[PDB]
Design a protein around this nucleic acid. Structure first.
Ligand SMILES: [K+]
Ligand SMILES: [K+]
Ligand SMILES: [K+]
Ligand SMILES: [Mg+2]
Ligand SMILES: [Mg+2]
Ligand SMILES: [Mg+2]
Ligand SMILES: [Mg+2]
Ligand SMILES: [Mg+2]
Ligand SMILES: [Mg+2]
Ligand SMILES: [Mg+2]
Ligand SMILES: [Mg+2]
Ligand SMILES: [Mg+2]
Ligand SMILES: [Mg+2]
Ligand SMILES: [Mg+2]
Ligand SMILES: [Mg+2]
Ligand SMILES: [Mg+2]
Ligand SMILES: [Mg+2]
Ligand SMILES: [Mg+2]
Ligand SMILES: [Mg+2]
Ligand SMILES: [Mg+2]
Ligand SMILES: [Mg+2]
Ligand SMILES: [Mg+2]
Ligand SMILES: [Zn+2]
Ligand SMILES: [Zn+2]
Lengths: 97, 91, 63, 97, 212, 127, 25, 202
RNA sequence: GGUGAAAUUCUUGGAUUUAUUGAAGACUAACUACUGCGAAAGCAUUUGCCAAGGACGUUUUCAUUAAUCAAGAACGAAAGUUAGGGGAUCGAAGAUGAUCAGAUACCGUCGUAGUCUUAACCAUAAACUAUGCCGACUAGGGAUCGGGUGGUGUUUUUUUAAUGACCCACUCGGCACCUUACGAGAAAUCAAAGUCUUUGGGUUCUGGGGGGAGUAUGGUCGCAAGGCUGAAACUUAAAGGAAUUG
RNA sequence: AAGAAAAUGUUUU
């Protein structure tokens, strides 16, 4: 599932948590995938999709809200969007859709 | 310390109005004064205004709900019934 | 009232609470490839012609 | 004393078996304890299979059968002679006739 | 004192357009009058006819077909496919002890607009050399078999209209497809499509009904 | 070549119904019962009453224009009996014998995929 | 007496005793 | 004020003039601020949308239902109440519905209603617990509180007044044909006493 | 309609029956078994998610970490309690019909509470296998569920094979069962209720004639119903278990 | 297929 891939990404790869750093990565062109929490506001979701299509970046929609995304990424705070910068030894980039 | 054994919030009513009435009022007052998770921002910041109005201190969004709880059991079953009927209509 | 007769081809046994009735399989004289089971009150033996007011009622045992 | 070595039922390793209702009196009896008989009678015997065959519009109709599982309570089974009181040695014979 | 059968008139239920035989029978309905029309009294009637009578072959003695009067043309009631079911005798005959009964049901929309629920049934069976007397499945076989049957039914519809699915049910090609796809999972003697239920129909589209 | 109706023999205890309808079931022809054929308040379910009722149903059907009936036999069903009454066989035999043609007999007793609570209490009728 | 109804009668008697002692002081 | 249900202020665009029309709906529960409300025959079956009664499926739960098309809401307006659509008659286009009192009502299928239940439900489940709370409840509704008992008045003041003991003296069940000044007590009561039995008579 | 027979009851404002739709709530038939899982109470529609669990396999790891357990806890059918929701069915109370010598009992027609659920209580059942748990040993047998191993096996197509199902043999663990009892028992019976006067593997709980009595009293828990703990005075020669003949 | 009613019997030997 996505929880195992995300956990392996946290423990091995590179990631950034939060809207501002995610947009920074997208506009730097150095993000591989962005995972958006289900309860993210739709305007923010659409802007992230616009940034991702401009940077030719893949978007995955997490089934949980920000609380569930924070738990999945292994943090004790809510996470609205995750940007995978390096996948590490994880198949999250390729095992999509 | 624990200041009361069982009255809880209804310790403000003293010995008046009867134990059973104070018990009912305790349950509904705790229910109406609790903080609830916001379905939009994901924070436990939804508090009641007047009866039936539940506003999130964060993101300033307010939802119509039950008088003393954010969502009633009637609300859950009506939402489910409308979802079922809507899905049948659309497919 | 239609008049129909049959002939007893087998005597099945005594029935009724007091054993007064006799169970007989009877073959209809007309259209002889037809047998029905009937309840009879009097003493019955084989090759005896019974007269039937009604033709179609499979007689069940009298408990 | 204990009349039946296992019990008057068939339940070991369960604790609870959902009840069924007797077809004759509607008494609640555990399904494992209920006396179950299958009735597979032809839909029309009536000493009249030949009558239905002659009256039928189809050649070689192959008239159907009616299937019915009947559950009896102990009292109803004994009164209706579905099962009979047996000698002490005969009780231990589970083989059907 | 009234004898209402004098004011009834007979209509021919020209029920199918593709099954084998357009004639299923006749029905009666009260004569059209000033304030009550026979076409209104009809046009909702469901006639359920045996597929054996509708195909002329007795190997369809089960699988009754439901046919709804949809439009009236001059004493002829043109119907359309409304649903299909096994007979109780066949269902109870297939359901036996000392074997596992596997049931699958899907809700899928046909090619044009038709929404259907398909109920398929299967029964575990012993092998030819089997000595064990019950031949049950391990319920992971049941889950896999149900998954396969659901996928098969969902594929067979959505590539078929109501008419194509109706012409597909009669030769029972779905049953042999289930047998081919689950034979490597567990034996499954008695695979059948026991029921087709029509949940929602599109706009009445008399043009589409006029396939006869 | 034949004009077909539906027989709809509902054979409970305490009564039997012989209900010939059209192939659709909307239009009904000569629904008749053993309660209308006998007056004893106990014999309503008797096979003789069922036979007389079926004879009357077949007569009126042959007057209306029905020549054959597809037979649908049922018990009370639901939660109660599942066993067809004493009158169903008599009604079916009488319809067969009265000149009507017979077709496609089916047992359509309403059988729950599971039931509401059956009447009688958990101890049942105690007689 | 059936033991179930013996228990029920004892329970009724016990409640009656509590009521009588409670009326007393 | 004086209303248990919260109100929803919903802004629509004027279709014929360039301006906004603000409407005061009764807030259905689940409706939030910033939510889009869709009103019309082609509106979706989502909570808070306003649809004609004939345009919703069987068993739909609606609120603020019109008795006549265009009266802008008459039925199921108190908090927690709703109307169920129990059937349609497209010919002679009508809708059979279940009202909060349990009455069956036939309404023109073009009469509108809001999908969902009125917010603020469960309001009357809390004991008022205080004459002060009843005072404040009725201070914003009307001058109907507190209420003096008729048996506690004088014969001049009420039918029930007078007597050396407080008692009605005659039956308090009052005929439907009684006149103003006589209708004190139980008007045209089909029965009295503690309700033992089932309601919703066939 | 209902019944052994009836009657209450509904019915030409069309009952019962039919057909067509629709809704509500409950429930999960058949398959369903001397079959499975769980500590027990219990658990039976599909699918998804979430954690959990036994057995097996292991030339994996730690190394005595363990057994049973006052006090102390968690869970604990049904009924019942409090507040919502829901209230189709059945249905303590109640209303009635009938039977009767009486019959506000059985039987019939309704029907409140309840039945379902949510959030809290309650903590009891013939909560049973009336059989504590852990460990070792002591007959024979065939089935069956889960896992594993092997076969010149059969079948299934993929293309060689291989998984699947089945067959054979073994094995570990489980629900049980058949015979015989070396053995035990008062017997019924028991592979444990055996390895007990040839009495000792470890450990917890309970009983000491029948009533009075699970009563009184005190304490404690519960909103309550009640739960847990729990006597005595006095009374009594049997009460009781299993089996035998009538 | 099934079949309504049926209460009571002093003490000791
Ligand atoms: K007065
Ligand atoms: K109820
Ligand atoms: K003496
Ligand atoms: Mg005994
Ligand atoms: Mg138990
Ligand atoms: Mg009658
Ligand atoms: Mg008896
Ligand atoms: Mg007042
Ligand atoms: Mg006053
Ligand atoms: Mg005064
Ligand atoms: Mg007066
Ligand atoms: Mg006056
Ligand atoms: Mg005075
Ligand atoms: Mg009618
Ligand atoms: Mg099932
Ligand atoms: Mg199983
Ligand atoms: Mg303890
Ligand atoms: Mg309860
Ligand atoms: Mg106990
Ligand atoms: Mg003692
Ligand atoms: Mg004895
Ligand atoms: Mg004596
Ligand atoms: Zn918020
Ligand atoms: Zn019974």
């Amino acid at each position: 599932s996505i929880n195992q891939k995300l956990a392996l990404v946290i423990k091995s790869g590179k990631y950034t948590l939060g809207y501002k750093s995610t947009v920074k990565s997208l506009r730097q062109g150095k993000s591989k995938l962005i995972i958006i929490a289900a309860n993210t506001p739709v305007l923010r979701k659409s802007e992230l999709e616009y940034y991702a299509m401009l940077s030719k970046t893949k978007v995955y929609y997490f089934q949980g809200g920000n609380n569930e995304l924070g738990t999945a990424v292994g943090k004790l705070f809510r996470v609205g969007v995750v940007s995978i910068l390096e996948a590490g030894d994880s198949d999250i980039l390729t095992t999509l859709a | 310390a624990k200041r009361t054994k069982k009255v809880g919030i209804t310790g403000k009513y003293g010995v008046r109005y009867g134990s059973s009435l104070r018990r009912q009022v305790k349950k509904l007052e705790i229910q109406q004064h609790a903080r609830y998770d916001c379905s939009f921002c994901g924070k436990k910041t939804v508090k009641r205004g007047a009866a039936g109005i539940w506003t999130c201190s964060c993101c300033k969004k307010t939802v119509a709900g039950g008088a003393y709880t954010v969502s009633t059991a009637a609300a859950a079953t009506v939402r489910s019934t409308i979802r079922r009927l809507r899905e049948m209509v659309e497919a | 009232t239609p008049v129909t007769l049959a002939k007893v081809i087998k005597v099945l046994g005594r029935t009724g609470s007091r054993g007064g009735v006799t169970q007989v399989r009877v073959e209809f004289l007309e259209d002889t490839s037809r047998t029905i089971v009937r309840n009879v009150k009097g003493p019955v033996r084989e090759n005896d012609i019974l007269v039937l007011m009604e033709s179609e009622r499979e007689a069940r045992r009298l408990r | 004393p204990k009349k039946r070595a296992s019990n008057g039922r068939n339940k070991k390793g369960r604790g609870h078996v959902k009840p069924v209702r007797c077809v004759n009196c509607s008494k609640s009896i555990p399904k494992d304890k209920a006396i179950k008989r299958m009735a597979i009678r032809n839909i029309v015997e009536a000493a009249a299979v030949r009558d239905l065959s002659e009256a039928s519009v189809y050649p070689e109709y192959a008239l159907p059968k009616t299937y019915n599982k009947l559950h009896y309570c102990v009292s109803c089974a004994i009164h209706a002679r579905i099962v009979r009181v047996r000698s002490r040695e005969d009780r231990k014979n589970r083989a059907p006739p | 004192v009234v004898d209402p059968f004098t004011r009834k008139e007979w209509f021919d239920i020209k029920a199918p357009s593709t099954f084998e035989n357009r004639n299923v029978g006749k029905t009666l309905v009260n004569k059209s009058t000033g304030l009550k029309s026979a076409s209104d009294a009809l046009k909702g009637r469901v006639v359920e006819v045996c597929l054996a009578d509708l195909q002329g072959s007795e190997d369809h003695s089960f699988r009754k077909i439901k046919l709804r009067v949809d439009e009236v043309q001059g004493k002829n009631l043109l119907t359309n496919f409304h649903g299909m079911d096994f007979t109780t005798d066949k269902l109870r005959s297939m359901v036996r002890k000392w074997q596992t009964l596997i049931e699958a049901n899907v809700t899928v929309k046909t090619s044009d607009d038709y929404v259907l629920r398909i109920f398929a049934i299967a029964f575990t069976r012993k092998q030819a050399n089997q000595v064990k007397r019950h031949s049950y499945a391990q319920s992971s076989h049941i889950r896999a078999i149900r998954k396969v049957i659901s996928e098969i039914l969902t594929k067979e519809v959505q590539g078929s209209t109501l008419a194509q699915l109706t012409s597909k049910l009669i030769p029972e090609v779905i049953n042999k497809e289930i047998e081919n796809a689950t034979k490597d999972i567990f034996p499954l003697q008695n695979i059948h499509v026991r029921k087709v239920k029509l949940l929602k129909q599109p706009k009445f589209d008399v043009g589409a009904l006029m396939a006869l | 070549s034949q004009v077909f109706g539906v027989a709809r023999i509902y054979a409970s205890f305490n009564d039997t119904f012989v209900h010939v309808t059209d192939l659709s079931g909307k239009e009904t022809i000569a629904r008749v019962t053993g309660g209308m054929k006998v007056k004893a308040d106990r014999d309503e379910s008797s096979p003789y009453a069922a036979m007389l009722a079926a004879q009357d149903v077949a007569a009126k059907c042959k007057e209306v224009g029905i020549t054959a009936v597809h037979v649908k036999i049922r018990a009370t069903g639901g939660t109660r009996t599942k066993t067809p009454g004493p009158g169903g066989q008599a009604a079916l035999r009488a319809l067969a014998r009265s000149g009507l043609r017979i077709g496609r007999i089916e047992d359509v007793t309403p059988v729950p995929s599971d039931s509401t609570r059956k009447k009688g209490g958990r101890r049942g009728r105690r007689l | 007496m059936r033991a179930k109804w013996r228990k029920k009668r004892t329970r009724r008697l016990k409640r009656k005793r509590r009521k009588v002692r409670a009326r007393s002081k | 004020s004086g209303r248990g249900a919260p109100l929803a202020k919903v802004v629509f665009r004027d279709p014929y003039k360039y301006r906004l029309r603000e409407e005061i709906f009764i807030a259905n529960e689940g409706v939030h601020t910033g939510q889009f409300i869709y009103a019309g025959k082609k509106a979706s079956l989502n909570v808070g949308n306003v649809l004609p009664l004939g345009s919703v499926p069987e068993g739909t739960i609606v609120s603020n239902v019109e008795e006549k098309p265009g009266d802008r809401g008459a039925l199921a307006r108190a908090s927690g109440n709703y109307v169920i659509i129990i059937g349609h008659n497209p010919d002679e286009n009508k809708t059979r519905v279940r009202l909060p009192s349990g009455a069956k009502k036939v309404i023109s299928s073009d009469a509108r209603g809001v999908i969902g239940v009125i917010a603020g439900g469960g309001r009357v489940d809390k004991p008022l617990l205080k004459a002060g709370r009843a005072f404040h409840k009725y201070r914003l509704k009307r001058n109907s509180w507190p209420k003096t008992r008729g048996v506690a008045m004088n014969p001049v003041d009420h039918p029930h007044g007078g007597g050396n003991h407080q008692h009605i003296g005659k039956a308090s069940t009052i005929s439907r044909g009684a006149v103003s000044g006589q209708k004190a007590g139980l008007i045209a009561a089909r029965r009295t006493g503690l309700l033992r039995g089932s309601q919703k008579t066939q």
